[PDB]
Every structure is written in structure tokens, then in C-alpha cells.
């Protein structure tokens, strides 16, 4: 590469080397396991370099990690996109043949694969042909990748390349047969923590990530870049402490112990946080969190409000940097009550600095910003996967019309507040008119003797594809369909064929589908009752 | 130009329409003339851009601007960039000659000019042969621009051009014979943009450009893009005053009634609002300033700050974006008394994200960071410019060995404070040492009878350059060159020949030459007094 | 594309309407369900090609077959790629898994599917996200493509495009953990097709495919071309029978009714149709046959030939084209008995035309051909797969050191008849010698109480890898290992130590690892016993 000095590369070297603020004291906390500071953060990452370059890694390869969140993930965060290979992050929890089918797609030279998931590499070792180097990470001190570590000098001269070069790339199970490979530049990572950092960083009082927070990630590292946060964190010169497994108890104590202020969760992991024993004595004053995994349900969001904790929502996905939306509230909205702005914190949000978003219907039609009128979310911005990796159909299906889709169906305030009502996949067509499939549950879920609601669509005659529902009986309640078809009648305020309630048809089915993550499978659920 | 909808570009226009945040019933206020809205704002833009387009001004042409701080400049800012024409501000305070030089050197095609630079254009009107049409802006009704923006539609689909594409140009007047034009791509003001954001954006209490501040710049717009500050402020959706002609009371009246919060001046601004008598019965807390311009004096930063001003000294020059390092105090740093910080917030400051900073020798060999050693600043950040226009010789000379250089003499503390000493081409160099020329202006300065001090090198035989300086007497005080003398050897902590006084010569000295600017030339001292 | 009608492509349009013998009233038979003309062909081959172009097929897209040998399938073979298209062929006897893999692989954009595979396809459907239309192949009138082709014209102008333009595709299940793409281009089909009926056209006597031969295959068509002889069929203006799903009672019929003359099956059809009953009365003068899918056993060519069949062996992979060697006798090997040529006609054969093959050691140095020294066969020739689809690193290991490496272990008499040993996965080291894992198989299948032999290898520590064989024990026969050691060392004519019986350690196990196809799954084996 000829470099032409004037001429600047956005490169993860410059978040590195080049941050908002370095403290090279600041410590990098890896739970009760390690304890650094950003000094040896940054010789760390030289020595990784080092060790990359030993292994036989070039410019364009692809260095694999299997681990939690941990200080090794950081590393590998800097250190493989730094010398010019592809991070690819890959999702442990998906199945042995979805994660065996990722790395063969990828074509891994090293994975470095965490001592515990050992026994998920076991079940496709032998179908692996394109690993020439397994590095077994360990929180002790018979870590492999510590040894490697520490046998390399702590000096490198990274390489500069073109800013255009990919830096991770990570598989994402969505609608398709198998999972689907996104990849992002150093150019997009750098301009994401930059869109970011200037979307959080500047806000007045609520929601801030600024120099002064205490990071730790509570989404998964081999996510979306954790949601771009640890480039953030990083940039920022900030403490950031990393907890490993997730543990509800362990993460209580890090945030205690650490006085972390600003982490990210999904809606589980902050339930589960909440509801733990351990937290009912703990000061959550101070301590800020984004929920973007999945909706934020207002209930969540009220108790964690009560618990004085800054929680707010923010919207992704794995093609999308991720972040495109996150909740920031004016000093008016800041003055309503626990029950007012617990609304406004679980909505999607406001689009982020460079992301423009428009709401679609299936001729690309962009609709009004009414609250509303809903459609699908069409979004452009600076950190968007072009395509799928060595995919041309799904890539073009991404990108038709010009803008990257989400499949998320929503509609838009006009202040700008982004609310999504559910998937485009999983819409209800009913002839003329489109209805969300997502508060349907919520309706039904408000009996006495119902644990949980799934919504489905499949075709009727007349009326076209109509919604069935599944609930589960409670104890010494034998209550037929009669009396679901009665409580869905005793309801109010809903539109249509009088109140909603002339073809529910509900029924009741002792196994729930569930998929690993948790998620229903609304496909499964289609293929089995169809 | 094929835009690739997935490969994104950096353009102002998303600056524009992809902010931070946008509150359209959020003021544009323009002193005392206009007050409209962000809506207005944006409709605003449009009609430029179709005015603009109506005049014949197509992507690649010239509009050059002669204008105050006005809601004209901050939408010059914009329409004309974003149709894809090069913004050449003009520097109003500039000879009438240099300014002709730089509009015959950049070709402008049309020049909005103020009415009351008409006396300039007057005398330089006949020796432009490359402006077809002049516009008159001025601040009542009959204004020119509002005449044509208000002929024109507020709808304009803005295009989509290689982000590469030169958005700015003005011209510098440093240490060459003719002013320099330097010139910024619309993906270096974007980067600019996002990086300032996220370096004072994320800081944790001081010095922080939020979206709840209250800009008003005191920096004229014709200078280095108002250092980047309306494209930050825009970007920010925050209320943005506009003051036109600098006036100090008209100052500090904007700053009373629109609650401004976030500024940036020269020292000589700041010591006039602090020192007139309207600003004693003001409350300037909540109000930080920025000091680039020159270097911040620790006296008129320690009176800053006796007025509860946040005050911190940034760093920059015309060709670098300008900011290149900006003054943020940690928290610890924030506790110490006001004699304490005054000297950490007058200091250059530490280098803003994304720009590495370093002090090499002549032979561009890196000096150690010990806050002792001092050489030439030489940056590389994105957004600097990467020549001089239509230059070959001084711009080779300007991105010498792979950086830029400053012309800054500088020493960096271990924790990355830089400290400019002088420049390099006003260098006393004696024997093998290198002294400041700016220091012994202060310590020439304690005399009851010196009202301003200049040095200036001229050689010796034995000792090379040696160091002249130049005072006034004062009322009843005919002391002679003894005298003089003798107060020089009076001070201590000196090194070299004893206390660096040997061959001081002082002279008096009736007429002391300034320049238009209000800082005294060395280089025409240096030919008159040789 | 510009022809530049000078500049000649090899295009299958030319195989199609430039044959060497063409005759209008020559048969297309399909079992006993249909029978037309070579005129009729023709017709419908355009008819496909305008079908296809109703459909939407365009130059570069994939069209995948599923479907037993028909008159379909032969049209399939020249309407998609005369029309630019690449026509994938699905094996259908591959786990439904796999053939989705296969099918999102290779993004096929119509699948013609027999309705004897709709339960495959209803397993994988909903995970096939790429295929637009299904056409349901059936046997009777109701078949969706026979209706598809009878709303369309016979007349069709065929386009000129590059002859490297790919036009088959399939995919191969060897020793990767996915199935491998391999493609062809129209030059590499059309230079196949000349270069095998010029190796076995020109045969003085035996062996020949000639223009009086009737073609019937017995390989499937979704395998590698049929080993390309329904193109050297239809070149040769041949009549040609295709049986459909392959029953030996069948395909007996199908011989003596048509009078076929030159089949191509594999070592297990053959056996199964001269096992028949059906096919002791059948005179099987005048039919050849040749053995290519496996090795040909001995027992098995020397039974065929009692039956006076014209039997020989070819050697190809999915690779290769397929074809790389076919056994051809001279005039005197011709007149040898019945034992004699049975040897002859078992081996691998000599390299056919353009085909230059080398034996070769892992440093890829050429081994002499000597009938002694093995090593694997490594090949260049004008119809090899320059890589894998889609991948990199597999297919850099394919063609390594500038060959196409066969992953076969052979030697080369002087005479260069090659013949096989084993595998090299499959190949057993010990200290500084490889031994085959398959005549071990033959050696230890003597004995009276044994039924199927696999020989697997595993480490040692003084002798290295050594071989372990499995054995099934026959009616109230309770051998233990010792008796079968015994059997071992009954034996004569070994080497190294003493006679190959130190580390036998036979034994015997209830249940033997068969895959789908019917070969033992070595891997399997490996992985299950350790
Ligand atoms: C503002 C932060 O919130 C997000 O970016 C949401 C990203 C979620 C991506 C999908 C997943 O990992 O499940
Ligand atoms: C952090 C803000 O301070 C600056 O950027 C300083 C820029 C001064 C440029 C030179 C001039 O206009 O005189
Ligand atoms: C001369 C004809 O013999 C061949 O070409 C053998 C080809 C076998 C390919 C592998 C398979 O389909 O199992």
C-alpha cells in the first residue's frame, strides 16, 4: 500500500492510537480473572500482533474467536483488523452445525476458542478443513493465548492499508436457511464509534457515554462489535471492566465493586439483573444501560426507573453497524414522571448522527412520519454491510431499492420518535390491511391463565391469512376454548370486523416452541401446525 | 456521479439532514436583524441552492463570500457546498490588494459581499476580470440574497457527489509572499465535525459542546470555517446566535438575552468583553469559551475564570481544520484553585481525536515527550489540507517527510499537554541551542516603563544570531539603554552566558511596527531595522 | 457479446447442430414411457430454451435438475447452457441437508424436480430462499415441463457468447466437510466430448463408441455429465435410451428390446444385472460396457465377460471432467483368456487423449512409472474444474504445485497403464513406508466366517500409525480374535514385519459404518473407534 500521508486512512489503528483521551493508568478490569492497565492494554495488543504475524497471519486472513467477554475480545477487537485480518466473531450460542457452516463459509486460518467451548468444537472438528491453528483461551494461567502472548515483544508497526479493507465480519441467523455473513471496514467501525460518540457523547444530561464512565459490556462480544461500545469505550480512554460468563450474581458484584455507569443488555439480562436478590441492596444511581437487543418492555423500563437506573432503548442489527436508532430525551421529557418517560425510553428512538431512515411499503414508497402509518424501516448510513458474504440474492433482497432492509415494520412521530411494531415476515395481511402480530400477545396475555402468546398467520378463504394464538392452562384451570374466545371479546378499543373477535379460533397446545436463543420460531410454528 | 446508495460518502448535506439532533422550531438568531427557526433554516438553504442554480453556479464553480457572522454565512456554509460549489471565504480584514490576489487566484464566479465591504470592492473591482455576478447583502429588507431566496422554492434535491469533492477554500497569510489557499473535501469537514463532537462531546463536566448549548461564535466565518464550530452546532440542533459585526457591548448584550453558552474567540475579544463596563453587572456563568486564535494569556484566562467563565485555549491553523488539540481538564484537574488551572486551560492542549501529534527536529526525527525538549509540531489528522491550491514549492514544503508542519515550536508533557514556545521561522538560534523568541517579550516586560516589547535575531561573529528588543519610554522617564540593561540583569533563573545578558542592545524605539492584524511583523522589523 | 464470426467458441449449441452424424428419424427413447425422433429433440430443445426464456432465465443463471435418467434430463443437459445458463445437477441421493446446502450454494434460480423427490424437497422448502418456480417433473401427461414446453415455439436462435462461460454445475461430497462445486465450461464440454470419442472412436476393435451404438445409460445423469457420454451420444447421432430409475429387471429389458450396445454403470449395477434371473437368457453379444464410478473388481469383469460382454474400466472424478483414463486392449492383450484380460480390463486404464498424468510424492516430485512406485495421481487436461466454487483454500490444495491432485494413489506400468491402490487420506504410514488400506480389506475377506473387511489406521508409539480391520462373525461360528490372527499369519507373500502379523488386532464388531452411497465411511469409522 502506498500510503500517501496527506491522503488519511480511517483505520481501527487510529481508534487505538489516536483517541479522544489516553490515560495509560486507566485500568482494563477482566472481572476477578485479570487487571491491567491501558498501557499494557496497548503493548498487549503489539504482542498480539506479533504473535499473529508468528502464526503465519497476512494481510486478508481471517482470525476466529470462540470466548466471552473478556480482555482477549478486546484484543482481538484491535489486534487482527490492525495487521489486516478479518475479525470473525462467532455466535456460541448458535447451533454446532450453524457455527461449523459459519467457519467453513469464512474460511478461518486460527480460531481462538475459549477452553469451555471445547466440547461444541468437538462435534465439528473433523468437518473443519480449514483451520490450521486452534488456541485455546483459559482464565487461569494455562491460557494459550497468554503464553503466545508473552513470548512476543510488545513493539509492532501496525500497517497502514485502505480504509475500505474489512475488519470483522459475523454470521447472522435471520430468515433465511443459514446463516448470513455481514462484514464491516475499518472505515465503517472507525465512522460508527465517531457517529456514535458524537450522537451519546453530546447529549445534555441523560444518556451520556463520556470520558468519565466506567464500561462494561453485558451484549455479547461476538455480536455486533458488542454494539460498537468497546471501540467507544476504548476511544474514550474510559475503565472498562469485562465479565466473562454472564452470571446475574457476577455482574451485581463487577458493577458494584467496579462502579461501572454505562453498560448495554438485552431485555432478559436486565430483568434478570432486577430481579436477583442481590440487587435489592444495591445503589444503581449512576449506573446507565441501552437496551437494543430486543423491544424494551415498558414494564422493564419503569422498574428499572425505579431503581433510579438511566435505562434507555436503542435499535440494531447485525447489518447495520448496528446502531441506527437510540432513545435520547430533552430536559422537558426528563421532568415527567416514571410512568410518562417510561414510554419514551422503551421506544425505538431517533435515528443516529448519518443514519437517514425512511418507512417504505413494498413498492418502496416512503410514508408519512405520523406515528401512525407504519412500514418497512429503510435505512442508509456509514456502517452498513454492503452485502451478504458470498451471497448475491439475499444481497440484492438487502439492498433493493437503494436502501438496506431492516424487516422491521414501524411507523415514525413526528418529532422523529421511531416505534416498531414487528417483524415484516411476521406481518398479518388481512384484505386490505396489515395488523402487527406482536400486540396481539400482549392482548391475550392478560387472562389469568395464560403464559404465553404466539401469533400466527396462515390463509382463510374469505378474509385471506387470518391469526391464530397458543396459550398454555394454569393449574386446576380446565378452561375450554369458549372462555379465551370470551376474554378476547370482554376487551375494547379495536378496530375491523367489530372488535377483533370473529375468527380467533384460539387454542390451547401443552409444548411452545422455543429456539435457543428464546425467541419463538414463528417459522417452525408454521411448517408444525401447517 | 454513480452513487453506489450502499457505498456511503461523507457530505455536508448529511451533515444538514442527518444531525445529531433536529428541533425545527429550534432559532437561528442573527443579532438583533433576523430570527427564524430550523425549518426556516433548511427551506432557506434550499432557495440558496436553487438561487444558486438559477445564477449558473454548477458543481466545481467558485462562490466567494464577504460577510459578518450572519444566518447568510452559516447558510453559505451549506447550499453552496452542498450543490457541489467550492465556499471561498474571504478574509475581509485582508489589504484590498491580498484580497483581489486570492479572488483572482481562486476564481470565484459570483461574490456575496456585504454592503459595507463595497468600499474594498471598490478599489479592486476593475482588476477582477472572473466574476460574472456580485451580490449585496445587507441587513435590512433590501438585501440582495434575501431578494433572491425569497424568488426561489424551498424544495431542492440536493446532489450526491464523491465525498473527495472540495467543499471550502480560503487563503492564509503566513510566512509567504502571497496568501496560500488551503481547501477542505466535504468528507474532511464531516470527519472534522464528528471528531470535535466526540472529543468535547464525551467530556464528562468541562468544556462540553451539548445539544443544550447556546452557540454564538466570536470568531469571524471567514476564517478556518469559524473553527469547524457551525457545522458542529448545526449538527447538534442547538440554538445558534449570530452577532454580525463584533461590537463588544452588541456581545454581550447576545450573550445576556439569548443565554449563550458555548463561544470561541481570540484573546483580544475575550480581554474586550471581560474589560468592558457592561460585563460587570453580567452573570457569565454557564458560558464557556474557547481560545484559539492565539495563544490564551494566563492573566486573561485567571480573569476568565474570576468571572466563572469555562475558558480552555484550543489549537489549530488554516491549514489543519483548523482544531488539531483543544484543553479538556480531568476531574482532578477541575479541583485545583484558579491560579492553578489557569495555567492548564491557556496551555495548547492535548491532540483531538483522530490527529497524531509529534515535535521532530530539521531532520524530522521525533523528540521525546518530556515537556522540555521542543521542535516543530508535524500532524497528520483527516482533515488537513493536502497542499496549498495552484502550489507546488510551498505545499512539498508544507507535507515535508509524511506530515505537516505547523511552524509551531512546541515541548509535550508525558500526559500529552502541548505547550507552543514560538514559531519556527521566529527561532533565535545561538551556537547550538534554539531559544524562544516570545518569552523574553514577557521578561522584557516587568519594567515600570516598557509598554511593548518585540525581539527580533540578527547575527553576530563569534555568538551567530543574537537577539535585539525593542521598548518605549514613558511619561517623564528618559532612562537610557543602561537602564535597560541593568533591569535585565536584575531578573534570575537564566542560563547560557550567565544570565543571558551579555549582548542585549536594547533599544528604544517611537514607532513599533504592526500589523493590520494587531501583531507585529518580524520579518518587516527584521528588514527595516537591517 | 461480439462473435466475431472468424473467432470459432466451443459452445454445446455446436455439439447440438454441428454433430458428426446427424440423422432426423434416429430415437430418442425414455424407457416405456415416451419415444420421438432426434427431429423432435431438436423441437424440443428450443421449445426448453423459450420456456426457460418466458421464465425469466437469463445468461448466468442457474437452473437445477432433480431427475432420473429421461429424454428431460438430455434436454436439460443443452437448453440451459445453449441459453447461457448454468445447469446445475442435483444428486438425489444426497442427505436433503446436503442438497439444500447445495441449492443456497449455488443460488439456483428454477429447480426442475421429479415428483419422486417432493419429499426431499418438503424437508428443506422453507429453507430455500433463492428458487422462484419448482416444475414437477412426472412420467405420465400431467408433467409440468412436457406443459411448459408444448405452450412454446420450436424456434429458437441460440446466442454466441464466450465458450469459457460456465455451463454445468454439481456438486461433490469427498473429504471436506460440505460438498464441493465443480464447474465446466462450454469449451471444457465440447473439448471432453471430442477428446473421448477420439480416444475410444478410434479403438481398432474393442471398446469402441461408434455411430451404429445404441447408448443407454446407468450412471446418473446428475453425476459428473453422465461421465459426458449423453454429449458424445447426441454428437454421434446415436439412438439413446435412457431407463429412468434404474431397476435391473428394467434395464435388462431395456438391452435386449433396444439392442443397446454401449452402456456405462458402476461395479454394483453391473453385478446386479448379471445376478438377474432375467438375465440368463439374454444375449449380451454386442453390448459394452465400462466400469468408471469404482474400481472394478475382477470376479465381476470376469464374470461379464463369460457373459460376453465388453467389459472395461475408465477412471474420472467430478473434477476431471470426468474422464481421465479408459482401459483400451490392443489386438494382442484381445487374445489373451478370459483371466488374463479380466486383469486388463479391471485396471484404471491409460490416460485418454490430451490428458497428461503424473504420479507424484506430498513434495510433488514425479515417480517413475515403473508398476511398483505409488504415489498420487496428479493431471492436466482440458476439462478440469479450475477450483471450487465459492472457496479458496480447498481449491488451492486441488490444484497444488500445477496440478490437479486426483487424491488417488497409484502406479504406471512402462506401458502407462495406471492402476490404483487406495486414497491418500486413506493411506496407512508406518515409519517410512505407505501401504494400501484395500488389498488389506481383500486379504483378510478369505476367510469362510468373514463378510465385509474395512481397514481404518490409528497411531502407535514405536511403529507409528498401524492398521485395525473389522470383521462380522456367520452362523454359530464363535471365532474369537485369536483364530482370525491365525488367519492372518496363514498367509504368504508379506513384508516388513515378517509377514505382516505383529499388530493386527483384528476384531469384530456387531454393526459396520455404511454411508447412504454404500461405501464405508472411513471417517466415521475413525471417529467412532477413537
Ligand atoms: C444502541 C444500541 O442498541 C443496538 O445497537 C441494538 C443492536 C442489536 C443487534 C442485534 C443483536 O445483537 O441481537
Ligand atoms: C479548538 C479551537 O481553536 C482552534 O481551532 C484554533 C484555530 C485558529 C486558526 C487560525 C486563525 O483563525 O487565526
Ligand atoms: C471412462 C468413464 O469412467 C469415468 O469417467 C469415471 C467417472 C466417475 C466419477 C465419480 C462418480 O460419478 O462416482
Known sequence: YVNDPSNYQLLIKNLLFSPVAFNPEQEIVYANHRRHSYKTFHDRVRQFANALTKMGVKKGDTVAVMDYDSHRYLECYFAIPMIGAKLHMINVRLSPEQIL??????????????????????????????????????????????????????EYNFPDFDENTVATTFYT???????????????????????????????????????????????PMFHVHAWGLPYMATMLGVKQVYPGKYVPDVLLNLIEQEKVTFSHCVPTILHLLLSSPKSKAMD??????????????????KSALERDIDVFAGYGMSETGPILSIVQLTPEQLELDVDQQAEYRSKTGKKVALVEAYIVDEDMNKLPHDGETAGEIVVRAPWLTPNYYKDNKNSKALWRGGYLHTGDVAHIDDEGFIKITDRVKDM??????????????????????????????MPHNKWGEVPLALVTLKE??????????????????????????????????????????????????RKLHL
Not at 457515554?209 to 453485558?218: A, N
Not at 384484505?431 to 392478560?446: A, F, K, R
Open 101 to 154: 457452516y459459519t467457519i467453513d463459509h469464512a474460511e478461518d486460518d486460527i480460531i481462538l476458542i475459549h477452553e469451555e467451548f471445547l466440547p461444541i468444537l468437538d462435534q465439528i472438528k473433523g468437518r473443519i478443513d480449514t483451520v490450521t491453528r486452534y488456541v485455546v483461551l483459559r482464565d487461569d494461567e494455562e491460557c494459550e493465548y497468554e503464553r503466545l502472548l508473552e513470548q512476543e515483544s510488545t
Open 173 to 219: 441467523t435471520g430468515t433465511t436457511g443459514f446463516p448470513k455473513g455481514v462484514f464491516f471496514t475499518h472505515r465503517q467501525l472507525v465512522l460508527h464509534t465517531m457517529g456514535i460518540l458524537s450522537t451519546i457523547g453530546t447529549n445534555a444530561s441523560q444518556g451520556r457515554l463520556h470520558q468519565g464512565d466506567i464500561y462494561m459490556p453485558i451484549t
Open 284 to 301: 444503581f444511581s449512576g449506573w446507565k444501560v441501552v437496551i437494543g437487543g430486543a423491544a424494551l418492555p415498558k414494564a422493564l423500563c
Open 428 to 457: 398479518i395481511k388481512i384484505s386490505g390491511e396489515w395488523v402487527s402480530s406482536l400486540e396481539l400477545e400482549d392482548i391475550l396475555h392478560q387472562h389469568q391463565s395464560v403464559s404465553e402468546v404466539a401469533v400466527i398467520g
Open 476 to 525: 386446576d384451570a380446565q378452561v375450554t376454548e369458549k372462555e379465551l374466545l370470551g376474554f378476547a371479546k370482554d376487551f375494547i378499543n379495536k378496530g375491523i370486523l367489530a372488535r377483533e373477535a370473529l375468527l380467533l379460533k384460539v387454542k390451547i397446545v401443552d409444548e411452545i416452541a422455543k429456539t435457543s436463543v428464546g425467541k419463538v420460531d414463528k417459522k417452525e410454528l
